[PDB]
Design a protein around this ligand. Structure first.
Ligand SMILES: [Mg+2]
Ligand SMILES: [Mg+2]
Ligand SMILES: [Mg+2]
Ligand SMILES: [Mg+2]
Ligand SMILES: [Mg+2]
Ligand SMILES: [Mg+2]
Ligand SMILES: [Mg+2]
Ligand SMILES: [Mg+2]
Ligand SMILES: [Mg+2]
Ligand SMILES: [Mg+2]
Ligand SMILES: [Mg+2]
Ligand SMILES: [Mg+2]
Ligand SMILES: [Mg+2]
Ligand SMILES: [Mg+2]
Ligand SMILES: [Mg+2]
Ligand SMILES: [Mg+2]
Ligand SMILES: [Mg+2]
Ligand SMILES: [Mg+2]
Ligand SMILES: [Mg+2]
Ligand SMILES: [Mg+2]
Ligand SMILES: [Mg+2]
Ligand SMILES: [Mg+2]
Ligand SMILES: [Mg+2]
Lengths: 100, 206, 142, 48, 140, 84, 141, 8, 72, 62, 68
RNA sequence: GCGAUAACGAACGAGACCUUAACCUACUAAAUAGUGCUGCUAGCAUUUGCUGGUAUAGUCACUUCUUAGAGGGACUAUCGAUUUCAAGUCGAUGGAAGUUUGAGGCAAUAACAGGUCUGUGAUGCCCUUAGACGUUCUGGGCCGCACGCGCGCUACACUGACGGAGCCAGCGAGUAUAAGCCUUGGCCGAGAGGUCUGGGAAAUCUUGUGAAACUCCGUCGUGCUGGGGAUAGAGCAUUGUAAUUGUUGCUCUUCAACGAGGAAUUCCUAGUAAGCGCAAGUCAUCAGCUUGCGUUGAUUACGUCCCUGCCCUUUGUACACACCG
């Protein structure tokens, strides 16, 4: 047995929720007790620049955004089982870190 | 009338509020009546309130202001001239103290004096301008009951504000003198000079 | 409670060659003396055991001499050095607190001492301009 | 008074005795081209 | 356990969570009696849900609220809403619904904000001005 | 790191390929009208709902001008411009 | 019923604990209380020169009572106010550190406070005993 | 905008 | 600069206060200043004692406003 | 001698800036002598607005 | 104002000309019905279309409507 | 949009759309959120109660609040008036929400001698190219002061200043062998600040950012006064290689105009205006500035074309580089 934490971060929620559900799915048919996923409060990375490359015109501003969504999943399983779950649910957008 | 024993003890005076809702738990709306048929529907005293602070939505529709309590409309007009905008608790304190001063003076019901000062302060005919693109022209027109009521509150608080400026007399007791004098129709009070001066000019335009 | 007195009030006081209104409260009456601010006057009154609830004329001569003694000798009455007007004096290096007539004299002496060496700060004092680096393009219109 | 520091303490600021100028604004056909090189229809025809 | 209902009232940002258990007439603000809620001049705003129905309704219930967020005035309005909603929610669950409809009538007939949270929120600020609608002063 | 090169399936539907292809034609001296219509018809031939080509600059004239060469149906405002 | 600190108004509880704490006399008052300003944002020293230190210690004790291990830096933030910057806008500035640190040190050796684990200063075993006592002797009148 | 003239 | 309100209480004003203040419908800090020509600070101390002496009944208590009335 | 006249019909906005309204008034006593008059403030029907002088009609304002 | 546009006015009257027997005078039933009759990309447009179809249905029962 | 109709039926733009805010005791879970219970534990009355602390093993429970994903919900819904009985509008009732539900993002057909080659290893041409107009080093300037003007910040006091006491937000940011991030807690120091440890690459720590107005109790008492805090002197620290032309911060002293502002003129219709602060950006240091955020929170319309700009229709034209003709 091993208390293992899996942290999921990505910018887009569709691939994030697929990986999140897929990990939960593999922790269900395998009789592994789980806690999660925990939807962490999303982070809005905001950058407000001036539209004008020069300094002439009405003072108009862009407001760019970069939402970061974070999910943490707690697993009680041996380390070999949890790591192979990660390769099952590998997605280009979502990065995975595994901590005991 | 029975005194209700709670685990959290409740003061005697506030338990008396179960019988009746009174302004600041001191002033009753039951014996208050508007001595003018034309402003009954625009001076709202039928729904009693404890404190003149309701934080309601009276600016959404057109005539919702007529549904705001008359004392709350009065305390709203006190907080003016920049440094007082948004200071409603200060305004409520002034009104609460003003009513007590209006009570020790003339001994009447303080909110009755407030109602009397409002009916006597709204000009019944104001001379609107009909200037044709710059030239000076004035025409005498009638004044709606809503504008008649809310110009009384505007004039009553403006007069109280200026009487307390650079004066040792406090604003609460400048308002009490302003409200008491206008209630009895005395021309000494501000907002009665203004009301007379408005209706005097309107007489010279019809 | 309200108390009464006769003949003891003094309408006009004269302290350090300055006329003091006797009906002003003592802490703020002493502020008329140049070189004595509210913060300094508040402390000399507490060092002289003069309770602040008294008007200037209420004070007796015994208290008045006790105050002018303290203002002229602050360090001798456990008044901290950092609280003083003129600390680390230029010539003798001791902590001082200049008062009504001494203030403009030693303020002057600082100006020529700056002007004698012809420092930039001393020069700008001579011209009547602002010396602390303020912009004079648009506000120096007096 | 060769050094500027020495002379500064001797030059007086005689500024309040002279009056400011009454006006001080000192900062036009944009539609008419001033290049003087007109474009012929052949050049527009060949390019576009 | 016992007869417990948990509710909440809201103003602009202030939110007051009320726990209503069966007991004696205990009514506390952050562990402190309601008779000393500040500011004093708005103390009757939280007395309204009490004196409107009569304190006899609180014999069998004790109320402990925890109010956080918002401001001084906004917290008072959150508390009075939590009390009024808490009393109604207890009646709906452990008393006949005839009384709950009775309680809801006096509260609604007096002030809508006693039961319905005010939906007004602060408008976002837009560039080109110091406020939501206000703009920088223009000069010609 | 491993790099793989993959061919774009629909050259007519890739504005990057069409812009690079158009640039390789304009730098060869082909006329703008013949060059612009070579991508207008190529885009529609691939099945595009719409296509618009704008070429701006100066061409044998001191004054500069811009010419738009549209085709088919084009949407301009709202979210769908980020999708289609 | 058991009276607590939370059952008495703060303004008149502090006025009662300050009077008791001064008459008890065991609180050690530093020698600069007649000189110092409470905060760098203040412009004048307290008007109640003889008693201001006692009342502030009473306020500090009550404030620590209702919370858990509040430090002295938080006390500077608590008693700080808006500074009167001349033409620039107002700003929040913390109160003086020594006055608060001396108060908690004075209260810690009188038996009301102690160093709490993981920082701050908890209220003492006897700190509850004597504050809750003053609360009872505050509201009987 | 200026013509750099040398002295040394 | 015309106020010149009296701040020191002599004997002529003291008994005049106790003979005139009771015959007032409403007394306050400004009322005492306005009609007795005494200063505001002297008015505040006069009110706090006159209430202790029973001449004056406190209608309402507040720092910024003191509403008082006759006790007779 | 003021006379009260309930309004029964809001005709329309008149005046140069639209700040004055044509309205149709009906007297409280002697429910006749219906007159058209101009009013400054906001007006609904059934306003008991009183008239300082009654013997005057109203027309469009310039 | 609350003036419905042409994308909702004409699309709603196509429903009446096509599914009048299955329609009704209830918005809630119409709202569910138009979700199985038309492919609506957004819920807000679905409610607008069903809300105007109900208004037209309520108007047909009071007499003949012009254009449908 | 209704409608009138030599037009009919359409497309772009508007609207739809997307993001955000408001509702959900209805789902899905949460030791990086909260609560009730339960252990253990404290104080006060002893009534079994009331406030706490503790519990990453009490190896509890739950999702009301908190977080966020899947959805639901509003479509002007129902009912009265008016209307060409049409589009609609105005009233009520219900509702979380009935101003396009609030706010934004995106945004047509052409075009401007609008602004930038001082953002670009974006650029054509002209100029310069070794005593350089390249690059770098040192010092100064961009701040310079008889003046006119604009964006703002403090104020002219008592609806206030001080002095104590009460004590409530939201949006965010945060590091490693650096070149040093956010920094609690303890101890010194009147302060500013210094010093020793620890936490945090973060819903975990800074941080409940205990913000300011605000509220209570006192002093002041209409006085250029305890309003206001320029100007200036002396001193103490911080950043930086370097503070002089004061970077900034702190202490004492100095106590200026200003006592509500002419002709004119700006912004604004509801959580809005106005106050009131806070964060992020610039940033070694410096915010009277912007970009946002929240606290307190109104007066007055909810109308018109009277002024002003723009749009449309008719009309005149010797204009079409289009009246700067
Ligand atoms: Mg201010
Ligand atoms: Mg479109
Ligand atoms: Mg759009
Ligand atoms: Mg604070
Ligand atoms: Mg404070
Ligand atoms: Mg100030
Ligand atoms: Mg929930
Ligand atoms: Mg409703
Ligand atoms: Mg919109
Ligand atoms: Mg140009
Ligand atoms: Mg600007
Ligand atoms: Mg204060
Ligand atoms: Mg560290
Ligand atoms: Mg927070
Ligand atoms: Mg001052
Ligand atoms: Mg002064
Ligand atoms: Mg600089
Ligand atoms: Mg900054
Ligand atoms: Mg800038
Ligand atoms: Mg309009
Ligand atoms: Mg016009
Ligand atoms: Mg023509
Ligand atoms: Mg021609």
């Amino acid at each position: 047995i091993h208390k293992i934490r899996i942290t999921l971060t990505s910018t887009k929620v569709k691939q994030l929720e697929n990986v999140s559900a897929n990990i939960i799915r593999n922790a269900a048919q395998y009789n592994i007790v789980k806690k999660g996923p925990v939807r962490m409060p999303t982070k809005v990375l905001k950058i407000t620049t001036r539209k004008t490359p020069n300094g002439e015109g009405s003072k108009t501003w862009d407001a760019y955004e970069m939402r970061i969504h974070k999910r943490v999943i707690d697993l009680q399983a041996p380390a070999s089982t949890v790591k192979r779950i990660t390769q099952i649910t590998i997605e280009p957008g979502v990065d995975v870190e595994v901590t005991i | 009338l029975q005194v209700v024993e709670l685990a959290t003890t409740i003061p005697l005076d506030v338990q008396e509020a179960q019988r009746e809702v009174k302004l600041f738990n001191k002033w009753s709306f039951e014996d208050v009546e508007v001595k003018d048929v034309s402003l009954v529907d625009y001076i709202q005293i039928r729904n009693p309130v404890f404190v003149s602070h309701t934080a309601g939505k009276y600016a959404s529709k057109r005539f919702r202001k007529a549904q705001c309590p008359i004392v709350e409309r009065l305390t709203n007009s006190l907080m003016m001239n920049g440094r007082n905008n948004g200071k409603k608790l200060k305004a409520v304190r002034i009104v609460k103290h003003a009513l007590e001063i209006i009570h020790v003076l003339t001994e009447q019901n303080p909110i009755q004096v407030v109602v009397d000062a409002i009916v006597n302060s709204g000009a019944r005919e104001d001379s609107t301008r009909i200037g044709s693109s710059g030239t000076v022209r004035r025409q005498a027109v009638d004044v709606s009951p809503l504008r008649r009521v809310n110009q009384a509150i505007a004039l009553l608080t403006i007069g109280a504000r200026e009487a307390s400026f650079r004066n040792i007399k406090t604003i609460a007791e400048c308002l009490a003198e302003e409200l008491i004098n206008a209630a009895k129709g005395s021309s000494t009070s501000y907002a009665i000079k203004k009301k007379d001066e408005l209706e005097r000019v309107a007489k010279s335009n019809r | 409670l309200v108390v009464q007195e006769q003949g003891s009030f003094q309408h006009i006081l004269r302290l350090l060659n300055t006329n003091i209104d006797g009906r002003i409260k003592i802490m703020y009456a002493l502020t008329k003396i140049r070189g004595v601010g509210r913060r300094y006057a508040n402390l000399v009154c507490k060092k002289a055991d003069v309770e602040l609830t008294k008007r200037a004329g209420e004070l007796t001569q015994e208290e008045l001499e006790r105050i002018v003694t303290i203002m002229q000798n602050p360090t001798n009455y456990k008044i901290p050095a950092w609280f003083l007007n003129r600390q680390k004096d230029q010539v003798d290096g001791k902590d001082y607190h200049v008062l009504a007539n001494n203030l403009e004299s030693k303020l002057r002496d600082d100006l020529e001492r700056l002007k004698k060496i012809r420092s930039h700060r001393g020069i700008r004092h001579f011209w009547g301009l602002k010396v602390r680096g303020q912009h004079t393009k648009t506000t120096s219109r007096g | 008074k060769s050094p500027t520091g020495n002379e500064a303490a001797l030059k007086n600021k005689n500024f309040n005795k002279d009056v400011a100028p009454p006006q001080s604004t000192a900062t036009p056909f944009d539609r008419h081209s001033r290049t003087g090189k007109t474009d012929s229809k052949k050049k527009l025809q060949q390019g576009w | 356990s016992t007869q417990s209902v948990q509710t909440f009232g809201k103003k602009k940002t202030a939110t007051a969570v009320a726990h209503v258990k069966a007991g004696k007439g205990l009514i506390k603000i952050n562990g402190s009696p309601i008779t000393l809620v500040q500011p004093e001049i708005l103390r009757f705003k939280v007395y309204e849900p009490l004196t409107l129905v009569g304190l006899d309704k609180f014999q069998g219930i004790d109320i402990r609220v925890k109010v956080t967020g918002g401001g001084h005035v906004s917290q008072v309005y959150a508390i009075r809403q939590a009390i009024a909603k808490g009393l109604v929610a207890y009646h709906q669950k452990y008393v006949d619904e005839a009384s709950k409809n009775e309680l809801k009538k006096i509260f609604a007939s007096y002030d809508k904000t006693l039961l319905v949270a005010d939906s007004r929120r602060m408008e976002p600020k837009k560039f080109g001005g110091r406020g939501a609608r206000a703009r920088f002063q223009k000069s010609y | 790191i491993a790099i793989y090169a993959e061919r774009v399936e629909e050259r007519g539907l890739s504005a990057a390929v069409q812009a690079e292809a158009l640039k390789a034609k304009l730098l060869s001296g082909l006329p703008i009208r013949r060059a612009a219509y070579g991508v207008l018809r190529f885009a529609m031939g691939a099945g595009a709902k719409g296509v618009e080509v704008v070429i701006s600059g100066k061409l044998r004239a001191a004054r500069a001008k811009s010419q738009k060469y549209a085709d088919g149906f084009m949407i301009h405002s709202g979210q769908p411009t980020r999708d289609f | 019923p058991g009276v607590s600190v939370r059952d008495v108004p703060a303004q008149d509880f502090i006025n009662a604990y300050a009077q008791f704490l001064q008459r008890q006399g065991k609180l050690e008052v530093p020698g600069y209380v007649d000189i110092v300003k409470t905060s760098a944002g203040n412009d004048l020293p307290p008007q109640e020169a003889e008693t201001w230190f006692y009342k502030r210690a009473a306020s500090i004790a009550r404030h620590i009572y209702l919370r858990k291990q509040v430090g002295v830096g938080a006390l500077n933030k608590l008693y700080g106010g808006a500074k009167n910057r001349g033409f620039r806008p107002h700003k929040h500035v913390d109160a003086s550190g020594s006055i608060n640190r001396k108060c908690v040190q004075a209260l810690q050796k009188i038996g009301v406070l102690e160093i709490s684990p993981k920082g701050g200063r908890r209220i003492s075993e006897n700190g509850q005993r004597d504050l809750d006592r003053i609360a009872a002797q505050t509201l009987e009148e | 905008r200026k013509k750099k003239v040398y002295t040394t | 600069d015309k106020a010149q309100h009296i701040v020191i209480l002599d004997q002529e004003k003291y008994d005049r206060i106790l003979k005139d203040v009771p015959t007032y419908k409403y007394v306050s800090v400004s009322v005492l200043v306005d009609r007795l020509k005494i200063g505001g600070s002297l008015a505040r101390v006069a009110l706090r004692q006159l209430e202790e002496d029973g001449i004056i009944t406190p209608v309402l208590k507040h720092s910024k406003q003191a509403i008082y009335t006759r006790a007779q | 001698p003021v006379t009260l006249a309930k309004v029964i019909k809001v005709l329309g906005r008149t005046g140069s800036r639209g700040g004055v309204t044509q309205v149709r008034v009906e007297f409280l006593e002697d429910a006749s002598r219906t007159i058209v008059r101009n009013v400054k403030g906001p007006v609904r029907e059934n306003d008991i607005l009183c008239l300082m002088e009654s013997e005057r009609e109203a027309r469009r304002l310039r | 104002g609350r003036v419905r546009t042409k994308t909702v006015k004409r699309a709603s009257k196509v429903l009446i000309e096509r599914f009048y027997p299955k329609l009704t005078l209830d918005f809630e039933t119409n709202k569910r019905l138009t979700s199985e009759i038309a492919v609506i990309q957004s819920k807000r447009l679905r409610n607008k279309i069903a809300g105007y179809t109900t208004h037209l249905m309520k108007r047909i029962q009071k007499g003949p409507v012009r254009g449908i």
